[PDB]
Amino acid sequence: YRKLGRTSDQRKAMLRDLATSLIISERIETTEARAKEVRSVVEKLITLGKKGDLASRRNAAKTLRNVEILNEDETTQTALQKLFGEIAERYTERQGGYTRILKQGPRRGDGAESVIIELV
Template identity: 60%
Template sequence: MSYRKLQRTSSQRKALLRDLTTELILHGSINTTVARAKEVRKTMDKMVTLAKKGDLSARRQAAKIVRDAVADVKEDGANVTVQTALQKLFDEIGPKYKDRNGGYTRMYKVMPRRGDGAPMVQLSLVD
């Protein structure tokens, strides 16, 4: 098998990866366990590759993975503009990495988790 099961059923695992990928898009970095980070890194690299393509087909494929979460709200007088995580992926993150051929994320080791001592990392997008 080429993926980690993360002690979850397939639907739970898919939901976990979708949530962590969306949070990484929204915030730019997340703190999680090493095993989860390695799996999210694969998903995030696929999402950035789709964002670099930028066509309608790629946007629909990415919409299957990225949750419909609000990334930013801008108010300009009576006009209110809401940016979702998918829009942020295609408008900001995709063009940012147009000249890069991979390796869009970076992992830094941090202190183990307090309760069970699980090894933790900070997964962030490369600047």
């Protein structure tokens, strides 16, 4: 698997940060390799959310960061709550996938292959 030019702990932390931000925003802009790695992470999180049980909730809290969303109608929830409420309902019938990568052009400061990754 990919190392992403980082150490083990840095990689783990960045992956779970990416996954949390994706659950928050539903589309994010990043590099190709990071997207190709975080894909599996977020898909496994959605699988846990579809299972729905307490043990899966805890095994997902192992990964997700504790973040508060400002929901419409002045409501507030967590990424875990969103994952287990809405994102599981949207994909209750879908078997796999849940994410799509769309390539964009290179950045300026680098020649890095930029990419959007979006929930479907």
